[PDB]
Design a protein around this ligand. Structure first.
Ligand SMILES: OC[C@H]1O[C@@H](O[C@H]2[C@H](O)[C@@H](O)[C@@H](O)O[C@@H]2CO)[C@H](O)[C@@H](O)[C@@H]1O
Ligand SMILES: OC[C@H]1O[C@@H](O)[C@H](O)[C@@H](O)[C@@H]1O
Length: 311
């Protein structure tokens, strides 16, 4: 048996995503390779956990039993244990499984087979390891289809592991837009709800090369009293949903891209953290050392003003 999800949310506390790493097609393709020293660096700065985006789908066969490939599995073990060695808690997920988003019907059983294998693999790992069902469900994996798939995933996971806390995200890309449509089974009592926060999207994502039409936002600033008032109102809505449904909240990803002016990024980041903490939510900054990075792996220095904002 596990622990009260609010206790495990407290255990998560402040975290950071190590992104553009294991969620790319191959680790290193998007610019980051998880170095073991990264865990000393993150723990020493004061973080309580790390979130590790993992694209298991490109490292598992496409035909039954959809076995995850040996070498990749060993690599993930090395990352998880590297973080556990420093006393960091760890969130692992299934990230960028695009076929599942485009054709959930056809990939439902493969997705559940991946969780069967991941849960089997780590069922005896420490209680500070968290299982995040699926990053940003979207597209044809509609709010309605997600509520059904997540319940199926929970059944699969819980059939093997009654100890680890599970993290459940929202549909429509995992933000607040489909939160009110999310439904977590009453029988599950060991889960945390996660939401990604990048609002205002045009500000956080301005110039993002992977977002169509983002060039039209370059230069946009953030920081007026109305900007602050609007963020607060959105957080208030999340808080109330949490209160109503009785589920802890984890803001699993939030951050502003390097193209936005530094001062607005710092202002936006420092402000989001202050407002999440007031609400006692756990969270993970997006991300450690890449395009939204706070740590420069070459110089081995942190962007001190941005770190200060995260603390
Ligand atoms: O899709 C590729 C891009 O991903 C970007 O990170 C995403 C992350 O995968 C999402 O889950 C969510 O958190 O938003 C992030 C930022 O849009 C990544 O930063 C880019 O470099 C990738 O090209
Ligand atoms: O709202 C749509 C956007 O959601 C973001 O979380 C993704 O990173 C973008 O790729 C996507 O275009």
């Amino acid at each position: 048996m596990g622990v009260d999800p609010f206790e495990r949310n407290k255990i998560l506390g402040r975290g950071i995503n190590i992104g553009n790493a294991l969620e790319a097609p191959n680790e290193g393709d998007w610019g980051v390779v998880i170095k073991d020293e990264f865990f000393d660096i993150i723990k020493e700065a004061g973080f309580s956990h790390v979130r590790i985006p993992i694209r298991w789908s490109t490292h598992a066969y496409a035909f039954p039993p959809y076995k995850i490939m040996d070498r990749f599995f060993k690599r993930v073990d090395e990352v998880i244990n590297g973080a556990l060695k420093r006393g960091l808690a760890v969130v692992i997920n299934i990230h960028h499984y695009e076929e599942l988003m485009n054709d959930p019907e056809e990939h439902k059983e493969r997705f559940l087979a991946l969780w069967k294998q991941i849960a089997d693999r780590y069922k005896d790992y420490p209680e500070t390891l968290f299982f995040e069902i699926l990053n940003e469900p979207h597209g044809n994996l509609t709010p309605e289809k997600w509520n059904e798939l997540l319940e199926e995933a929970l059944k699969v996971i819980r059939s093997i592991d009654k100890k680890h806390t599970i993290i459940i995200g929202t549909a429509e890309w995992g933000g607040i837009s489909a939160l009110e449509k999310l439904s977590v089974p009453k029988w599950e009592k060991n889960s945390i709800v996660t939401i990604h926060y990048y609002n205002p999207f045009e500000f956080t994502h301005q110039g993002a090369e992977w977002v169509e039409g983002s060039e039209k936002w370059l230069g946009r600033k953030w920081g007026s009293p109305d900007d602050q008032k609007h963020l607060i109102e959105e957080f208030n809505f999340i808080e109330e949903w949490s209160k109503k449904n009785k589920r802890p909240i984890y803001i699993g990803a939030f951050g502003a891209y390097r193209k936005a002016d530094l001062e607005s990024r710092i202002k936006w980041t420092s402000f989001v953290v202050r407002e999440m903490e007031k609400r006692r939510w756990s969270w993970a900054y997006w991300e450690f050392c890449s395009g939204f990075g706070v740590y420069d792996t070459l110089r081995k220095t942190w962007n001190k003003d941005l770190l200060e904002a995260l603390i």
